[PDB]
């Protein structure tokens, strides 16, 4: 039958966010804040193209977004966001009830400082 | 009487025509049914940019579009 | 195949309790420890004789009991849509119609007879 | 094609020839009907999930307490025809000669 | 000597487990019966001992015969006494069971049980008392505590 | 490791069944106005040792027309889904994290009938079919309601998996928005489970053992034990799907202490029903069973399908 | 005959159960959804006759997305043609875990 | 981020899984290198043997068979 | 080692079944339909099935339970036969398991088998899901229908199983 | 009294708390002291896996901690 075409490794070099789950899922809010906005473009193209393979110039654009979030929320502040995501990470699976106290230590930093 | 014929089995018949009566005269199945249509299991899309909408905002912090506070709010 | 695992150490474990019953403990002398005994007399044949049961009906109402469990089984997954009326519209219709069966044979001695 | 496939039809065709030829009991052959019916079940159970079309699982559920509700109809009989005779031989049941 | 230490060893071992429970059959023919009944009372416990009713013969480590053994029951007497694990134990208890006692003449009564199974611990008495049936039990336990059975087994 | 664990599930249950059948003793001779075992060993424990090792020694052996492959198949069987009943339950995380285990539990306790028949039909003496078909009768009245009364118990607040039951058992146990439907549960558990002669029509006096008419010597530690893990196995289900504690948060030890607590007295409760009452009755069963329980059911699966829309307590379901 | 009262009374209670692209029960796809949306787009106002004169292209690929069944015979050619290469011992290859 | 991150994974499957197919098939004759088994031209959605392949035993057991019975 | 699971599974499964179809004593056929049907819950759990394997598991083998009180109440031989007693019974039960081992053979030591279709040899993790991000769970909201959209359906299943239950009364009533 | 039934209640409630303390330790001696990640559905799976993806070792309990910002 038909022929197709698949774009080389010159396209695929992309560097992923290579941090956990476990924190990726934790700062969810605030990663779906800040950023993300742009990404609904990519979503965009995403379901009214349905073709993925296509859509990857903003996919590279959202994982440079996520980065420079983690970026961002790294060289300010804080550091008991670490405290925070491994407070969390530990519960089996994620519950966000398990840990409040350095939510809400973590939630004033970023609010009063950034 | 009508009681002790077959007493926990009237008890019985009695429990099972409350539990029939009683949803018709029910002030919280319009509670059920908004608590149950806003919890998102799936994505919600976004739309091409509009024909200027004047809804369905453009950042989901804006609340011109259907938000919900009732749920820390009783 | 992790409960597959347990299965398989269970099996091990219950093939060696058979292997310690068998081999380990003394002989094995037979001969009359074999015959069938009912309480002290030697009887007329043996089990697998025609045995006409008491009950007819309870089987069967146990097997359409089961299978109204089956249809009923999913009620968590009913109480979370959209549609709550039609929900409970046919939970009710079905507890209501299994009543209305065991209404009908309780009320046609159906139970009644050889329990 | 799904290799698993092959065996479960396979468990069919096998279910459908014990179902027609058969030595003396009709318990063996509500049996042998009974498993014809979970042949069916887990074939089409195997063909849904392979088509995730999961708005349609109805036909494993109601496939399997119809059939069931058959099997009790045909245990209702069985214990009829052992009522009016000793046993469910297929040897008298030569009566009403055709 | 280490093979025989350790088949002294585990001989005790298997013994003392022998000699721990005991579970009976409650057999019982007559009176004697009423004696076992009142060996099941609060004042003179069987269950420190480990001496358990199972009431049926497949798992039973020792049968008293208690009662009057008859010509028409006897084959039912060792027809249960045939089937059982293969060690097995008889406690005659009463005079009617172990020797014939008031009965001993008199058609259709075996003269005493020694005609039918062998018989290892005798308490007579019409009926034994409570407290001697425990003697009895005693004494077979102490019997139990001389097997010698693996040591006889290894230096064969 | 996982190996070590499956170690760590293995030996604890025989201990448990050993020492359970000291404490049947015990504590039915301190009921029974007189005194348990109490010479032998220390105070009672190394005779049920020794109970193992004088049951190991028995030489077990066969039948006459008792065919030897169902014959040896049937408690090993019993023995086998006895032991894996005890794979989704949560000590505080369980082995397998089952998606759903209440199903899981109904079907294997439905093995164990189907053990205790096909050693009641292999023994082959027309007692151990008596006792066979008494069993058939107690499990088609109790397979139907327990089932439904545990649907009724999941449908509030479980759906199914046992974690997210023990996150519901925080505020109030469940004993409280079920009491009488708990009630019925639990003399149900108790006639399944085929202890306490209140509801149990198989080791009876009328019969002699009907289960163990001749199987033979050995094998009835198999089922002896099956039996009592049945009992442990129903208690510390009951002990879990009700009532318990709102766990100390990542830390196992007071939550493992207040959990076997509970469980055993549960048990020790279970065991005082035993030593109380009389005999039961195969036509009362039935009639007792389907013409008292059943409506009463009904009415508490409808008014619990219709309580989370009477007051929207519908749960948050995974 | 195959009557519609399905249709006259104005009340669809079988039709939501016909085929996958009808409304599954929270908003999710099938695994063939776009193939049958072809298809059906293809055959509506057509005979059944030169649905399968017409329609005969759109129909195979929906069946072939269905059993995937000329993908299962290259992918096990691609499989023997490996195994009788390494029997062989020609170059065995080693890109995955590698590079 | 995860829907993007699928994405790059499963092209770089399907790139580096037709130059092994393109290296390995290429002295049998018929067989073109990578023609659609389909005769329209869109992106199927591919069933874990396009993708996961020859990934000798234990990558394919821990990929398409650990979420079933493990965890 | 092990990549065929299911098919292995499915030969198991057609092992139990066979003898289970090839008409020994009913109770010794209930033997082998609670074998296969443990071995196909197997099959349908270990594909992917979440809880609906476990569900017919239940229900058809308390139906089974049911079989063998009515195959031990009605009729039996004065020595009921096994697999291995009679001519037949060992007949067709090892040529079913010559069938078997000849379709293992036929497909291990080949490419494709075509009596009724053309059936691919190797296993079924082919083909299959590309793990969806569903979090849904397929089988969950699918059987949460019959009771949103399925309306009529339960009504006249429901509606069959009260006329079963007058049925079976009315035919044991009808002396 | 209930004096000496005391001592095989305990014995045997011993006997019941070993599986559960047993189980804990092995859990938390499995994974480098993490309680275990449960997966109910399949995204917690995929999570997992990428988890497992990212950490180099093929075991996920590494975790990385906020040190692949670069
Ligand atoms: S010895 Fe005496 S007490 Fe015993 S059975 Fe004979 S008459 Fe009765």
Same mark, same amino acid.
């Given at each position: 039958?038909?022929?197709?075409?698949?774009?080389?490794?010159?396209?695929?070099?992309?560097?992923?966010? %290579?941090?956990?789950?476990?924190?990726? %899922?934790?700062?969810?809010?605030?990663?779906?804040?800040?950023?993300?906005?742009?990404?609904?473009?990519?979503?965009?193209?995403?379901?009214?193209?349905?073709?993925?393979?296509?859509?990857?110039?903003?996919?590279?654009?959202?994982?440079?977004?996520?980065?420079?979030?983690?970026?961002?929320?790294?060289?300010?502040?804080?550091?008991?966001?670490?405290?925070?995501?491994?407070?969390?990470?530990?519960?089996?699976?994620?519950?966000?009830?398990?840990?409040?106290?350095?939510?809400?230590?973590?939630?004033?930093?970023?609010?009063? %400082?950034? | 009487?009508?009681?002790?014929?077959?007493?926990?089995?009237?008890?019985?018949?009695?429990?099972?025509?409350?539990?029939?009566?009683?949803?018709?005269?029910?002030?919280?199945?319009?509670?059920?049914?908004?608590?149950?249509?806003?919890?998102?299991?799936?994505?919600?899309?976004?739309?091409?940019?509009?024909?200027?909408?004047?809804?369905?905002?453009?950042?989901?912090?804006?609340?011109?579009?259907?938000?919900?506070?009732?749920?820390?709010?009783? | 195949?992790?409960?597959?695992?347990?299965?398989?150490?269970?099996?091990?474990?219950?093939?060696?309790?058979?292997?310690?019953?068998?081999?380990?403990?003394?002989?094995?002398?037979?001969?009359?420890?074999?015959?069938?005994?009912?309480?002290?007399?030697?009887?007329?044949?043996?089990?697998?004789?025609?045995?006409?049961?008491?009950?007819?009906?309870?089987?069967?109402?146990?097997?359409?009991?089961?299978?109204?469990?089956?249809?009923?089984?999913?009620?968590?997954?009913?109480?979370?849509?959209?549609?709550?009326?039609?929900?409970?519209?046919?939970?009710?219709?079905?507890?209501?119609?299994?009543?209305?069966?065991?209404?009908?044979?309780?009320?046609?001695?159906?139970?009644?007879?050889?329990? | 094609?799904?290799?698993?496939?092959?065996?479960?039809?396979?468990?069919?065709?096998?279910?459908?020839?014990?179902?027609?030829?058969?030595?003396?009991?009709?318990?063996?052959?509500?049996?042998?009907?009974?498993?014809?019916?979970?042949?069916?079940?887990?074939?089409?159970?195997?063909?849904?999930?392979?088509?995730?079309?999961?708005?349609?699982?109805?036909?494993?559920?109601?496939?399997?307490?119809?059939?069931?509700?058959?099997?009790?109809?045909?245990?209702?009989?069985?214990?009829?025809?052992?009522?009016?005779?000793?046993?469910?031989?297929?040897?008298?049941?030569?009566?009403?000669?055709? | 000597?280490?093979?025989?230490?350790?088949?002294?060893?585990?001989?005790?071992?298997?013994?003392?487990?022998?000699?721990?429970?005991?579970?009976?059959?409650?057999?019982?023919?007559?009176?004697?019966?009423?004696?076992?009944?009142?060996?099941?009372?609060?004042?003179?416990?069987?269950?420190?001992?480990?001496?358990?009713?199972?009431?049926?013969?497949?798992?039973?480590?020792?049968?008293?015969?208690?009662?009057?053994?008859?010509?028409?029951?006897?084959?039912?007497?060792?027809?249960?006494?045939?089937?059982?694990?293969?060690?097995?134990?008889?406690?005659?208890?009463?005079?009617?069971?172990?020797?014939?006692?008031?009965?001993?003449?008199?058609?259709?009564?075996?003269?005493?049980?020694?005609?039918?199974?062998?018989?290892?611990?005798?308490?007579?008495?019409?009926?034994?008392?409570?407290?001697?049936?425990?003697?009895?039990?005693?004494?077979?336990?102490?019997?139990?505590?001389?097997?010698?059975?693996?040591?006889?087994?290894?230096?064969? | 490791?996982?190996?070590?664990?499956?170690?760590?599930?293995?030996?604890?249950?025989?201990?448990?069944?050993?020492? @359970?059948?000291?404490?049947?003793?015990?504590?039915?001779?301190?009921?029974?106005?007189?005194?348990?075992?109490?010479?032998?060993?220390?105070?009672?424990?190394?005779?049920?040792?020794?109970?193992?090792?004088?049951?190991?020694?028995?030489?077990?052996?066969?039948?006459?027309?008792?065919?030897?492959?169902?014959?040896?198949?049937?408690?090993?069987?019993?023995?086998?889904?006895?032991?894996?009943?005890?794979?989704? @339950?949560?000590?505080?995380?369980?082995?397998?994290?089952?998606?759903?285990?209440?199903?899981?539990?109904?079907?294997?306790?439905? @093995?164990?009938?189907?053990?205790?028949?096909?050693?009641?039909?292999?023994?082959?003496?027309?007692?151990?079919?008596?006792?066979?078909?008494?069993?058939?009768?107690?499990?088609?009245?109790?397979?139907?309601?327990?089932?439904?009364?545990?649907?009724?118990?999941?449908?509030?607040?479980?759906?199914?998996?046992?974690?997210? @039951?023990?996150?519901?058992?925080?505020?109030?146990?469940?004993?409280?928005?079920?009491?009488?439907?708990?009630?019925?549960?639990?003399?149900?558990?108790?006639?399944?489970?085929?202890?306490?002669?209140?509801?149990?029509?198989?080791?009876?006096?009328?019969?002699?053992?009907?289960?163990?008419?001749?199987?033979?010597?050995?094998?009835?530690?198999?089922?002896?034990?099956?039996?009592?893990?049945?009992?442990?196995?129903?208690?510390?289900?009951?002990?879990?799907?009700?009532?318990?504690?709102?766990?100390?948060?990542?830390?196992?030890?007071?939550?493992?202490?207040?959990?076997?607590?509970?469980?055993?007295?549960?048990?020790?409760?279970?065991?005082?029903?035993?030593?109380?009452?009389?005999?039961?009755?195969?036509?009362?069963?039935?009639?007792?069973?389907?013409?008292?329980?059943?409506?009463?059911?009904?009415?508490?699966?409808?008014?619990?399908?219709?309580?989370?829309?009477?007051?929207?307590?519908?749960?948050?379901?995974? | 005959?195959?009557?519609?009262?399905?249709?006259?009374?104005?009340?669809?209670?079988?039709?939501?159960?016909?085929?996958?692209?009808?409304?599954?029960?929270?908003?999710?796809?099938?695994?063939?959804?776009?193939?049958?949306?072809?298809?059906?787009?293809?055959?509506?106002?057509?005979?059944?006759?030169?649905?399968?004169?017409?329609?005969?292209?759109?129909?195979?690929?929906?069946?072939?997305?269905?059993?995937?069944?000329?993908?299962?015979?290259?992918?096990?050619?691609?499989?023997?043609?490996?195994?009788?290469?390494?029997?062989?011992?020609?170059?065995?290859?080693?890109?995955?875990?590698?590079? | 981020?995860?829907?993007?991150?699928?994405?790059?994974?499963?092209?770089?499957?399907?790139?580096?899984?037709?130059?092994?197919?393109?290296?390995?098939?290429?002295?049998?004759?018929?067989?073109?290198?990578?023609?659609?088994?389909?005769?329209?031209?869109?992106?199927?959605?591919?069933?874990?043997?396009?993708?996961?392949?020859?990934?000798?035993?234990?990558?394919?057991?821990?990929?398409?068979?650990?979420?079933?019975?493990?965890? | 080692?092990?990549?065929?699971?299911?098919?292995?599974?499915?030969?198991?499964?057609?092992?139990?079944?066979?003898?289970?179809?090839?008409?020994?004593?009913?109770?010794?056929?209930?033997?082998?339909?609670?074998?296969?049907?443990?071995?196909?819950?197997?099959? &349908?759990?270990?594909?992917?099935?979440?809880?609906?394997?476990?569900?017919?598991?239940?229900?058809?083998?308390?139906?089974?339970? &049911?079989?063998?009180?009515?195959?031990?109440?009605?009729?039996?031989?004065?020595?009921?036969?096994?697999?291995?007693?009679?001519?037949?019974?060992?007949?067709?039960?090892?040529?079913?398991?010559?069938?078997?081992?000849?379709?293992?053979?036929?497909?291990?030591?080949?490419?494709?088998?075509?009596?009724?279709?053309?059936?691919?040899?190797?296993?079924?993790?082919?083909?299959?899901?590309?793990?969806?991000?569903?979090?849904?769970?397929?089988?969950?909201?699918?059987?949460?229908?019959?009771?949103?959209?399925?309306?009529?359906?339960?009504?006249?299943?429901?509606?069959?199983?009260?006329?079963?239950? &007058?049925?079976?009364?009315?035919?044991?009533?009808?002396? | 009294?209930?004096?000496?039934?005391?001592?095989?209640?305990?014995?045997?409630?011993?006997?019941?708390?070993?599986?559960?303390?047993?189980?804990?330790?092995?859990?938390?001696?499995?994974?480098?002291?993490?309680?275990?990640?449960?997966?109910?559905?399949?995204?917690?799976?995929?999570?997992?896996?990428?988890?497992?993806?990212?950490?180099?070792?093929?075991?996920?309990?590494?975790?990385?901690?906020?040190?692949?910002?670069?």
């Amino acid at each position: 039958p038909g022929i197709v075409e698949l774009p080389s490794l010159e396209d695929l070099k992309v560097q992923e966010v %290579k941090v956990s789950s476990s924190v990726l %899922k934790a700062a969810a809010h605030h990663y779906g804040a800040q950023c993300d906005k742009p990404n609904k473009e990519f979503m965009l193209c995403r379901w009214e193209e349905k073709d993925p393979r296509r859509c990857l110039e903003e996919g590279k654009l959202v994982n440079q977004c996520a980065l420079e979030f983690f970026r961002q929320i790294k060289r300010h502040c804080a550091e008991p966001f670490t405290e925070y995501w491994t407070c969390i990470d530990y519960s089996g699976l994620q519950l966000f009830r398990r840990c409040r106290k350095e939510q809400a230590q973590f939630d004033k930093c970023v609010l009063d %400082k950034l | 009487n009508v009681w002790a014929k077959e007493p926990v089995l009237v008890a019985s018949f009695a429990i099972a025509g409350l539990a029939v009566i009683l949803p018709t005269l029910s002030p919280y199945t319009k509670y059920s049914l908004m608590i149950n249509r806003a919890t998102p299991y799936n994505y919600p899309v976004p739309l091409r940019d509009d024909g200027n909408m004047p809804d369905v905002p453009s950042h989901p912090q804006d609340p011109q579009g259907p938000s919900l506070e009732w749920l820390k709010r009783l | 195949m992790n409960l597959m695992i347990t299965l398989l150490t269970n099996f091990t474990l219950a093939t060696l309790l058979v292997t310690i019953a068998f081999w380990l403990p003394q002989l094995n002398v037979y001969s009359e420890k074999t015959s069938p005994y009912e309480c002290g007399f030697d009887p007329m044949g043996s089990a697998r004789l025609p045995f006409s049961m008491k009950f007819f009906l309870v089987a069967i109402t146990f097997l359409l009991f089961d299978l109204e469990i089956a249809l009923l089984l999913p009620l968590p997954w009913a109480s979370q849509t959209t549609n709550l009326n039609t929900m409970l519209t046919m939970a009710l219709l079905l507890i209501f119609l299994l009543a209305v069966s065991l209404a009908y044979e309780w009320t046609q001695k159906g139970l009644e007879w050889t329990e | 094609m799904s290799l698993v496939y092959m065996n479960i039809m396979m468990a069919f065709t096998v279910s459908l020839t014990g179902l027609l030829m058969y030595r003396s009991h009709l318990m063996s052959s509500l049996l042998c009907l009974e498993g014809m019916m979970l042949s069916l079940f887990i074939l089409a159970t195997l063909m849904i999930l392979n088509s995730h079309f999961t708005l349609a699982s109805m036909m494993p559920i109601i496939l399997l307490v119809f059939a069931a509700c058959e099997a009790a109809l045909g245990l209702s009989l069985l214990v009829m025809v052992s009522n009016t005779y000793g046993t469910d031989y297929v040897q008298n049941l030569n009566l009403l000669q055709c | 000597s280490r093979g025989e230490y350790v088949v002294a060893k585990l001989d005790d071992l298997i013994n003392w487990a022998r000699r721990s429970s005991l579970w009976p059959m409650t057999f019982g023919l007559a009176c004697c019966a009423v004696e076992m009944m009142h060996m099941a009372a609060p004042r003179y416990d069987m269950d420190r001992f480990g001496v358990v009713f199972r009431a049926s013969p497949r798992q039973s480590d020792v049968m008293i015969v208690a009662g009057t053994l008859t010509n028409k029951m006897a084959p039912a007497l060792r027809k249960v006494y045939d089937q059982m694990p293969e060690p097995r134990y008889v406690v005659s208890m009463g005079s009617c069971a172990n020797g014939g006692g008031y009965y001993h003449y008199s058609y259709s009564v075996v003269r005493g049980c020694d005609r039918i199974v062998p018989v290892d611990i005798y308490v007579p008495g019409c009926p034994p008392t409570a407290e001697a049936l425990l003697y009895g039990i005693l004494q077979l336990q102490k019997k139990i505590k001389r097997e010698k059975r693996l040591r006889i087994w290894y230096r064969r | 490791m996982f190996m070590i664990n499956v170690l760590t599930l293995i030996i604890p249950i025989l201990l448990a069944v050993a020492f @359970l059948t000291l404490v049947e003793r015990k504590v039915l001779g301190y009921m029974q106005f007189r005194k348990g075992p109490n010479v032998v060993g220390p105070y009672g424990l190394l005779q049920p040792i020794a109970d193992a090792i004088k049951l190991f020694i028995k030489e077990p052996l066969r039948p006459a027309t008792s065919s030897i492959s169902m014959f040896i198949l049937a408690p090993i069987l019993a023995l086998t889904l006895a032991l894996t009943m005890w794979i989704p @339950l949560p000590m505080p995380y369980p082995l397998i994290n089952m998606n759903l285990g209440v199903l899981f539990m109904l079907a294997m306790s439905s @093995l164990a009938v189907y053990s205790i028949l096909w050693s009641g039909w292999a023994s082959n003496s027309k007692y151990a079919l008596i006792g066979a078909l008494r069993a058939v009768a107690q499990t088609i009245s109790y397979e139907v309601t327990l089932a439904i009364i545990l649907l009724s118990v999941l449908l509030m607040n479980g759906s199914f998996t046992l974690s997210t @039951l023990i996150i519901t058992q925080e505020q109030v146990w469940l004993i409280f928005p079920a009491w009488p439907l708990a009630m019925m549960w639990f003399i149900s558990t108790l006639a399944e489970t085929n202890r306490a002669p209140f509801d149990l029509t198989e080791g009876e006096s009328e019969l002699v053992s009907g289960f163990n008419v001749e199987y033979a010597a050995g094998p009835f530690a198999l089922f002896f034990m099956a039996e009592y893990a049945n009992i442990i196995m129903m208690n510390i289900f009951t002990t879990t799907l009700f009532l318990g504690a709102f766990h100390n948060p990542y830390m196992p030890e007071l939550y493992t202490i207040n959990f076997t607590i509970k469980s055993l007295l549960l048990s020790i409760t279970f065991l005082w029903i035993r030593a109380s009452y009389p005999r039961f009755r195969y036509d009362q069963l039935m009639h007792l069973l389907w013409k008292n329980f059943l409506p009463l059911t009904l009415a508490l699966c409808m008014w619990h399908v219709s309580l989370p829309i009477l007051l929207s307590s519908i749960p948050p379901q995974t | 005959p195959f009557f519609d009262v399905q249709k006259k009374l104005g009340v669809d209670l079988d039709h939501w159960m016909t085929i996958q692209s009808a409304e599954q029960p929270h908003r999710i796809p099938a695994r063939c959804h776009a193939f049958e949306k072809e298809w059906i787009e293809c055959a509506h106002g057509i005979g059944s006759i030169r649905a399968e004169k017409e329609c005969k292209i759109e129909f195979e690929d929906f069946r072939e997305c269905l059993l995937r069944q000329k993908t299962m015979k290259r992918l096990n050619a691609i499989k023997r043609q490996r195994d009788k290469l390494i029997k062989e011992g020609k170059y065995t290859p080693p890109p995955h875990h590698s590079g | 981020l995860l829907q993007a991150e699928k994405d790059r994974r499963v092209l770089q499957m399907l790139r580096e899984n037709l130059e092994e197919e393109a290296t390995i098939m290429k002295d049998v004759p018929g067989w073109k290198v990578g023609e659609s088994v389909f005769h329209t031209t869109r992106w199927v959605t591919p069933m874990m043997g396009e993708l996961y392949g020859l990934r000798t035993g234990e990558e394919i057991l821990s990929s398409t068979y650990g979420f079933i019975w493990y965890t | 080692m092990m990549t065929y699971i299911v098919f292995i599974l499915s030969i198991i499964f057609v092992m139990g079944f066979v003898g289970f179809s090839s008409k020994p004593s009913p109770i010794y056929g209930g033997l082998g339909l609670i074998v296969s049907g443990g071995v196909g819950c197997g099959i &349908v759990l270990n594909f992917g099935g979440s809880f609906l394997g476990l569900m017919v598991f239940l229900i058809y083998l308390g139906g089974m339970m &049911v079989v063998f009180g009515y195959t031990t109440a009605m009729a039996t031989e004065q020595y009921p036969e096994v697999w291995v007693s009679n001519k037949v019974v060992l007949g067709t039960f090892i040529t079913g398991l010559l069938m078997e081992f000849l379709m293992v053979y036929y497909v291990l030591k080949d490419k494709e088998v075509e009596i009724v279709f053309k059936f691919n040899g190797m296993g079924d993790w082919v083909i299959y899901d590309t793990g969806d991000s569903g979090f849904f769970s397929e089988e969950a909201m699918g059987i949460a229908a019959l009771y949103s959209y399925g309306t009529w359906l339960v009504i006249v299943t429901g509606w069959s199983l009260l006329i079963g239950v &007058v049925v079976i009364m009315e035919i044991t009533r009808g002396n | 009294m209930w004096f000496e039934v005391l001592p095989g209640i305990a014995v045997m409630g011993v006997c019941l708390f070993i599986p559960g303390m047993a189980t804990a330790r092995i859990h938390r001696f499995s994974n480098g002291g993490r309680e275990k990640r449960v997966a109910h559905y399949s995204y917690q799976w995929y999570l997992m896996e990428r988890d497992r993806r990212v950490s180099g070792v093929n075991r996920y309990y590494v975790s990385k901690g906020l040190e692949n910002i670069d």
